[PDB]
Write a protein that binds this ligand. Structure first.
Ligand SMILES: NS(=O)(=O)c1ccc(CCO)cc1
Ligand SMILES: NS(=O)(=O)c1ccc(CCO)cc1
Ligand SMILES: NS(=O)(=O)c1ccc(CCO)cc1
Ligand SMILES: NS(=O)(=O)c1ccc(CCO)cc1
Ligand SMILES: [Zn+2]
Length: 257
Protein backbone atom coordinates (compact mmCIF):
# COMPACT_ATOMS: atom_id res chain seq x y z
CA UNK A 1 0.00 0.00 0.00
CA UNK A 2 3.05 2.26 0.02
CA UNK A 3 3.49 4.70 -2.83
CA UNK A 4 4.54 8.23 -3.70
CA UNK A 5 1.34 10.14 -2.95
CA UNK A 6 0.59 12.51 -0.10
CA UNK A 7 -1.12 9.72 1.81
CA UNK A 8 1.27 6.82 1.20
CA UNK A 9 4.57 8.44 0.24
CA UNK A 10 8.08 8.60 1.72
CA UNK A 11 6.90 10.37 4.92
CA UNK A 12 4.62 7.42 5.73
CA UNK A 13 6.92 4.51 4.92
CA UNK A 14 8.50 4.26 8.38
CA UNK A 15 5.18 3.13 9.92
CA UNK A 16 5.38 -0.22 8.14
CA UNK A 17 9.10 -0.25 7.35
CA UNK A 18 10.84 1.13 10.46
CA UNK A 19 14.27 0.76 8.83
CA UNK A 20 13.22 3.88 6.87
CA UNK A 21 14.86 5.80 9.75
CA UNK A 22 17.92 3.52 9.79
CA UNK A 23 21.65 4.17 9.75
CA UNK A 24 22.42 3.54 6.07
CA UNK A 25 19.41 4.69 4.08
CA UNK A 26 19.41 5.73 0.43
CA UNK A 27 19.40 7.88 -1.57
CA UNK A 28 21.75 10.59 -0.29
CA UNK A 29 23.09 13.91 -1.48
CA UNK A 30 26.59 13.51 -2.87
CA UNK A 31 28.60 16.49 -1.64
CA UNK A 32 31.41 16.47 -4.18
CA UNK A 33 33.68 18.57 -1.99
CA UNK A 34 33.38 16.18 0.96
CA UNK A 35 33.70 12.99 -1.13
CA UNK A 36 37.28 11.71 -1.15
CA UNK A 37 39.28 10.02 -3.90
CA UNK A 38 40.06 6.44 -2.86
CA UNK A 39 43.22 4.97 -4.42
CA UNK A 40 42.28 1.52 -3.06
CA UNK A 41 39.29 1.22 -5.40
CA UNK A 42 39.90 -1.30 -8.19
CA UNK A 43 38.84 -0.60 -11.77
CA UNK A 44 35.09 -1.09 -12.29
CA UNK A 45 34.12 -3.92 -14.66
CA UNK A 46 30.72 -3.84 -16.35
CA UNK A 47 30.41 -7.08 -18.32
CA UNK A 48 27.07 -7.07 -20.12
CA UNK A 49 27.95 -8.63 -23.49
CA UNK A 50 26.00 -11.84 -22.80
CA UNK A 51 23.02 -10.15 -21.11
CA UNK A 52 19.68 -11.86 -21.67
CA UNK A 53 16.75 -9.51 -21.17
CA UNK A 54 13.36 -11.21 -20.90
CA UNK A 55 10.44 -8.99 -20.06
CA UNK A 56 9.32 -5.49 -19.10
CA UNK A 57 6.78 -5.08 -16.27
CA UNK A 58 4.79 -2.14 -14.85
CA UNK A 59 4.76 -2.94 -11.12
CA UNK A 60 2.73 0.10 -10.05
CA UNK A 61 5.83 1.93 -8.79
CA UNK A 62 8.09 1.99 -11.87
CA UNK A 63 8.76 -0.35 -14.79
CA UNK A 64 11.37 -3.11 -14.61
CA UNK A 65 13.31 -4.66 -17.45
CA UNK A 66 14.07 -8.16 -16.16
CA UNK A 67 17.03 -10.38 -17.02
CA UNK A 68 17.88 -14.07 -16.89
CA UNK A 69 20.12 -14.32 -13.81
CA UNK A 70 20.43 -18.12 -13.72
CA UNK A 71 24.06 -17.79 -14.88
CA UNK A 72 26.82 -15.15 -14.95
CA UNK A 73 25.54 -13.59 -18.21
CA UNK A 74 25.63 -9.92 -17.20
CA UNK A 75 27.79 -9.06 -14.22
CA UNK A 76 29.33 -6.17 -12.33
CA UNK A 77 32.73 -6.63 -10.67
CA UNK A 78 35.60 -4.51 -9.39
CA UNK A 79 35.37 -1.03 -7.99
CA UNK A 80 34.46 -1.33 -4.31
CA UNK A 81 33.09 -4.83 -4.88
CA UNK A 82 34.39 -8.15 -3.63
CA UNK A 83 33.20 -10.90 -5.93
CA UNK A 84 30.64 -11.08 -8.68
CA UNK A 85 27.25 -9.38 -8.85
CA UNK A 86 24.66 -10.57 -11.36
CA UNK A 87 22.26 -8.20 -13.15
CA UNK A 88 18.63 -9.03 -12.35
CA UNK A 89 16.73 -5.92 -13.52
CA UNK A 90 16.88 -2.24 -14.28
CA UNK A 91 14.34 0.51 -13.77
CA UNK A 92 14.15 4.30 -13.49
CA UNK A 93 12.85 7.01 -11.17
CA UNK A 94 11.67 10.26 -12.74
CA UNK A 95 9.83 13.52 -12.21
CA UNK A 96 6.77 15.39 -13.37
CA UNK A 97 9.08 18.17 -14.60
CA UNK A 98 12.66 18.19 -15.90
CA UNK A 99 14.00 19.84 -12.73
CA UNK A 100 13.28 16.84 -10.50
CA UNK A 101 13.21 13.06 -10.65
CA UNK A 102 16.54 11.70 -9.47
CA UNK A 103 16.93 10.04 -6.08
CA UNK A 104 20.58 10.81 -5.52
CA UNK A 105 21.55 14.45 -5.85
CA UNK A 106 24.94 15.99 -6.58
CA UNK A 107 25.70 19.10 -4.53
CA UNK A 108 21.91 19.27 -4.11
CA UNK A 109 21.30 19.17 -7.88
CA UNK A 110 18.34 17.02 -8.93
CA UNK A 111 18.44 15.39 -12.35
CA UNK A 112 15.40 14.63 -14.52
CA UNK A 113 15.63 10.91 -13.81
CA UNK A 114 17.86 8.17 -12.49
CA UNK A 115 18.52 4.68 -13.87
CA UNK A 116 19.16 1.79 -11.44
CA UNK A 117 20.83 -1.39 -12.67
CA UNK A 118 20.28 -3.88 -9.86
CA UNK A 119 22.71 -6.73 -9.17
CA UNK A 120 23.00 -9.44 -6.50
CA UNK A 121 26.09 -11.04 -5.00
CA UNK A 122 26.38 -14.54 -6.42
CA UNK A 123 27.95 -15.96 -3.26
CA UNK A 124 24.44 -15.84 -1.72
CA UNK A 125 22.87 -18.05 -4.38
CA UNK A 126 19.64 -16.11 -5.04
CA UNK A 127 18.27 -12.57 -4.77
CA UNK A 128 16.09 -13.45 -1.78
CA UNK A 129 19.09 -14.62 0.22
CA UNK A 130 21.17 -11.65 -0.95
CA UNK A 131 18.71 -9.18 0.59
CA UNK A 132 19.41 -10.71 3.99
CA UNK A 133 23.09 -9.67 3.75
CA UNK A 134 24.95 -6.38 4.30
CA UNK A 135 26.82 -6.87 0.99
CA UNK A 136 24.03 -8.62 -0.87
CA UNK A 137 23.36 -6.08 -3.63
CA UNK A 138 25.11 -3.60 -5.87
CA UNK A 139 23.11 -0.94 -7.69
CA UNK A 140 24.69 1.03 -10.51
CA UNK A 141 23.01 4.43 -10.65
CA UNK A 142 23.11 6.69 -13.67
CA UNK A 143 21.67 10.20 -13.90
CA UNK A 144 19.53 11.34 -16.82
CA UNK A 145 19.50 14.92 -18.05
CA UNK A 146 17.32 16.28 -20.84
CA UNK A 147 19.15 17.16 -24.04
CA UNK A 148 19.86 14.97 -27.05
CA UNK A 149 18.08 11.62 -27.44
CA UNK A 150 19.67 8.43 -26.11
CA UNK A 151 19.39 5.94 -28.98
CA UNK A 152 19.83 2.93 -26.67
CA UNK A 153 16.79 4.02 -24.65
CA UNK A 154 14.38 4.24 -27.57
CA UNK A 155 13.36 0.56 -27.57
CA UNK A 156 12.31 0.98 -23.94
CA UNK A 157 10.34 4.15 -24.74
CA UNK A 158 8.52 2.49 -27.60
CA UNK A 159 7.26 -0.48 -25.58
CA UNK A 160 5.75 1.64 -22.80
CA UNK A 161 2.39 1.95 -24.60
CA UNK A 162 1.93 -1.77 -24.06
CA UNK A 163 2.52 -1.65 -20.29
CA UNK A 164 0.59 1.50 -19.38
CA UNK A 165 -0.99 0.19 -16.20
CA UNK A 166 0.03 -1.76 -13.10
CA UNK A 167 0.38 -5.49 -13.69
CA UNK A 168 0.95 -5.29 -17.44
CA UNK A 169 4.04 -6.89 -18.97
CA UNK A 170 5.50 -7.40 -22.43
CA UNK A 171 8.24 -9.46 -24.04
CA UNK A 172 11.51 -7.55 -23.97
CA UNK A 173 14.10 -9.98 -25.27
CA UNK A 174 17.33 -9.04 -27.04
CA UNK A 175 17.79 -5.67 -25.36
CA UNK A 176 21.38 -4.50 -24.81
CA UNK A 177 21.69 -2.55 -21.53
CA UNK A 178 25.14 -1.32 -22.63
CA UNK A 179 23.30 1.29 -24.69
CA UNK A 180 22.20 3.03 -21.48
CA UNK A 181 25.70 3.82 -20.19
CA UNK A 182 27.64 7.09 -20.51
CA UNK A 183 31.21 7.13 -21.88
CA UNK A 184 32.96 7.35 -18.52
CA UNK A 185 32.73 4.87 -15.66
CA UNK A 186 34.00 7.37 -13.06
CA UNK A 187 31.85 6.93 -9.96
CA UNK A 188 31.08 7.66 -6.33
CA UNK A 189 30.36 4.80 -3.94
CA UNK A 190 28.88 4.40 -0.47
CA UNK A 191 26.97 1.77 1.57
CA UNK A 192 23.20 2.20 1.51
CA UNK A 193 19.79 0.68 1.04
CA UNK A 194 16.98 -0.03 -1.33
CA UNK A 195 15.25 3.30 -2.03
CA UNK A 196 11.75 1.78 -1.89
CA UNK A 197 10.13 -0.43 0.72
CA UNK A 198 11.30 -2.75 2.15
CA UNK A 199 14.26 -0.27 2.34
CA UNK A 200 16.70 -3.07 3.21
CA UNK A 201 20.26 -2.03 4.01
CA UNK A 202 22.01 -4.41 1.64
CA UNK A 203 23.30 -2.19 -1.15
CA UNK A 204 26.72 -1.05 -2.29
CA UNK A 205 25.80 2.02 -4.33
CA UNK A 206 27.91 2.92 -7.35
CA UNK A 207 26.72 6.21 -8.85
CA UNK A 208 28.29 7.31 -12.13
CA UNK A 209 29.56 10.87 -12.34
CA UNK A 210 28.64 11.37 -15.99
CA UNK A 211 24.92 11.68 -16.72
CA UNK A 212 23.40 10.33 -19.90
CA UNK A 213 21.37 12.66 -22.08
CA UNK A 214 17.84 11.72 -23.10
CA UNK A 215 15.41 13.78 -25.16
CA UNK A 216 12.40 15.66 -23.84
CA UNK A 217 10.25 13.33 -25.94
CA UNK A 218 11.77 10.24 -24.33
CA UNK A 219 11.15 11.39 -20.76
CA UNK A 220 7.67 12.66 -21.69
CA UNK A 221 6.77 9.09 -22.57
CA UNK A 222 7.85 7.85 -19.11
CA UNK A 223 5.36 10.37 -17.68
CA UNK A 224 2.44 8.84 -19.62
CA UNK A 225 2.63 5.60 -17.64
CA UNK A 226 0.08 4.92 -14.87
CA UNK A 227 0.55 3.94 -11.22
CA UNK A 228 -2.98 2.50 -11.30
CA UNK A 229 -4.31 -0.71 -12.80
CA UNK A 230 -6.50 -1.00 -15.88
CA UNK A 231 -10.02 0.34 -15.35
CA UNK A 232 -9.03 2.37 -12.28
CA UNK A 233 -8.86 6.19 -12.05
CA UNK A 234 -5.79 7.42 -13.91
CA UNK A 235 -2.83 8.42 -11.76
CA UNK A 236 0.15 9.42 -13.88
CA UNK A 237 3.37 7.62 -12.93
CA UNK A 238 5.50 10.66 -12.10
CA UNK A 239 7.64 11.70 -9.12
CA UNK A 240 8.38 8.11 -8.12
CA UNK A 241 11.56 9.15 -6.27
CA UNK A 242 12.54 9.17 -2.60
CA UNK A 243 14.34 12.32 -1.45
CA UNK A 244 17.84 12.35 0.01
CA UNK A 245 18.21 10.74 3.45
CA UNK A 246 20.61 11.52 6.33
CA UNK A 247 24.19 10.50 5.57
CA UNK A 248 24.85 9.62 9.22
CA UNK A 249 28.07 7.68 9.78
CA UNK A 250 29.07 7.31 6.14
CA UNK A 251 31.78 8.50 3.78
CA UNK A 252 31.30 8.74 0.04
CA UNK A 253 34.35 7.69 -1.94
CA UNK A 254 35.29 8.80 -5.44
CA UNK A 255 36.98 6.62 -8.05
CA UNK A 256 38.50 9.65 -9.75
CA UNK A 257 40.68 12.62 -8.84
N1 LIG B 1 3.69 2.69 5.74
S1 LIG B 1 3.20 2.54 4.22
O1 LIG B 1 3.84 3.58 3.47
O2 LIG B 1 3.40 1.18 3.84
C1 LIG B 1 1.46 2.85 4.18
C2 LIG B 1 1.00 4.15 4.01
C3 LIG B 1 -0.36 4.38 3.99
C4 LIG B 1 -1.27 3.35 4.15
C5 LIG B 1 -2.76 3.62 4.13
C6 LIG B 1 -3.15 3.88 2.69
C7 LIG B 1 -0.79 2.06 4.32
C8 LIG B 1 0.57 1.80 4.34
N1 LIG C 1 10.28 -7.94 -11.55
S1 LIG C 1 11.78 -8.00 -10.98
O1 LIG C 1 12.56 -7.09 -11.76
O2 LIG C 1 11.70 -7.79 -9.56
C1 LIG C 1 12.43 -9.62 -11.24
C2 LIG C 1 13.41 -9.83 -12.19
C3 LIG C 1 13.92 -11.10 -12.37
C4 LIG C 1 13.46 -12.18 -11.63
C5 LIG C 1 14.03 -13.56 -11.84
C6 LIG C 1 12.48 -11.95 -10.68
C7 LIG C 1 11.95 -10.68 -10.48
N1 LIG D 1 18.13 21.55 -5.86
S1 LIG D 1 18.34 22.00 -7.39
O1 LIG D 1 18.14 20.83 -8.20
O2 LIG D 1 17.52 23.15 -7.61
C1 LIG D 1 20.03 22.49 -7.60
C2 LIG D 1 20.59 22.46 -8.86
C3 LIG D 1 21.93 22.77 -9.01
C4 LIG D 1 22.72 23.11 -7.92
C5 LIG D 1 24.18 23.45 -8.10
C6 LIG D 1 25.00 22.20 -7.84
C7 LIG D 1 22.13 23.14 -6.67
C8 LIG D 1 20.79 22.83 -6.50
N1 LIG E 1 15.38 1.57 -6.21
S1 LIG E 1 16.38 0.39 -5.84
O1 LIG E 1 17.24 0.16 -6.96
O2 LIG E 1 16.99 0.70 -4.58
C1 LIG E 1 15.44 -1.09 -5.61
C2 LIG E 1 15.89 -2.28 -6.16
C3 LIG E 1 15.22 -3.46 -5.88
C4 LIG E 1 14.10 -3.47 -5.06
C5 LIG E 1 13.37 -4.76 -4.75
C6 LIG E 1 11.96 -4.74 -5.29
O3 LIG E 1 11.96 -4.95 -6.69
C7 LIG E 1 13.66 -2.26 -4.52
C8 LIG E 1 14.32 -1.08 -4.79
ZN1 LIG F 1 15.53 2.33 -7.98
Amino acid sequence: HWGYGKHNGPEHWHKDFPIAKGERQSPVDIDTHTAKYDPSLKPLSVSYDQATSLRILNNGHAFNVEFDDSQDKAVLKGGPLDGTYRLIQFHFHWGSLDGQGSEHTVDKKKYAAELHLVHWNTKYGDFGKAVQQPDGLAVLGIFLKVGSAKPGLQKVVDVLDSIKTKGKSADFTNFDPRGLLPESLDYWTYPGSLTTPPLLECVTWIVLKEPISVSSEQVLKFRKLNFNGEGEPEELMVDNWRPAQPLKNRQIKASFK
